[PDB]
Amino acid sequence: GHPFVSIADSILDNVLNLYQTEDGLLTETYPVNPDQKITYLAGNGTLKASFLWPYSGMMSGCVAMYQATGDKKYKTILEKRILPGLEQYWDGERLPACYQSYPVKYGQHGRYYDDNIWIALDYCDYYRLTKKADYLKKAIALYEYIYSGWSDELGGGIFWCEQQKEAKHTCSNAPSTVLGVKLYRLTKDKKYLNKAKETYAWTRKHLCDPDDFLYWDNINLKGKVSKDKYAYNSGQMIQAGVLLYEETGDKDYLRDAQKTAAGTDAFFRSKADKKDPSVKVHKDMSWFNVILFRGFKALEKIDHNPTYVRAMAENALHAWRNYRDANGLLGRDWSGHNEEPYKWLLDNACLIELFAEIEK
């Protein structure tokens, strides 16, 4: 069943009301910070919209809600509001064409290979739900751009930022593997399955820590590995492993997924909760946890181990009941320890997908 769809529905309507701009976009935060700083870009005046990354969480949420409920309300929100808003980021001037990080009416802005993977993944899922030709075409066109980010440097792998090609990242290779499997299922073209297998093998060899089965962040062109461990990176390799096991029957992919998942739960579900210090909470930001939930939920369907999905769903519901602000919005920390007066769009948009995905 879908016990928390009412919560996900409430967040969607509240975010749309509070964050909407007159030109059909969404602000970076609520309330707006006049001195807004953006710390997540590679390496001007006032901001008038959000960047692509937080905006994209609205598409994952709306698609998840349409999948969970079948309610045309969510199809209408995507067709009339979210997808026309997303088009304001489409840069067809620099090639291959893709969605750039900030609206095109504000000039040229950085283009990220990974931003385009998350959108291509939602286009795959939304095409499966509607059969509208345009969505499959967008997903195939986006894949071509994503793979224009691949090179033989370091034996393979995809870059992160098209304008600053300095390293090959787990965040640009692990969801790329998931994307390949999804495109193989929709088109039956073996080229997608072969590239998914090759991208997975490259990432496992160079970016998986052999001591704990957790994924490192990236490897630069000089061969230096950045060993920072984030929940979404291990989470996408769990989902990639499960999907590749479903496609090949090769148990090594399942075994990888189970080892990374056990190591992930032990390492990330380690932060003391504010209200009840005896409860362990996922330490990473809200959106990284929602991406990890895709991997845990995928594995649970195979092995029926509910440990990881139950514990994270409990963490999110606890935060929902206790740490919302006056505007009914949440910050990035589900342990409730960090006060954020200006609530990031993504910290709330990601909850629409999460509460739509909890099945209990």
UniProtKB/TrEMBL annotation:
SUPFAM superfamilies in the record: Six-hairpin glycosidases
GO molecular function: hydrolase activity
Coiled coil segments of this chain: none
GO biological process: carbohydrate metabolic process
InterPro entries: 6-hairpin_glycosidase_sf, Glyco_hydro_76, MUG_Protein, O_gly_hydro
Keywords from the named record: Hydrolase, Signal
Pfam family, one: Glyco_hydro_76
PANTHER family referenced in this protein's UniProt entry, alphabetically: (PUTATIVE SECRETED PROTEIN)-RELATED (PTHR47791:SF4), MEIOTICALLY UP-REGULATED GENE 191 PROTEIN (PTHR47791)
Protein name per the record: Glycoside hydrolase family 73
Species name: Bacteroides thetaiotaomicron (strain ATCC 29148 / DSM 2079 / JCM 5827 / CCUG 10774 / NCTC 10582 / VPI-5482 / E50)
Source lineage: Bacteria, Pseudomonadati, Bacteroidota, Bacteroidia, Bacteroidales
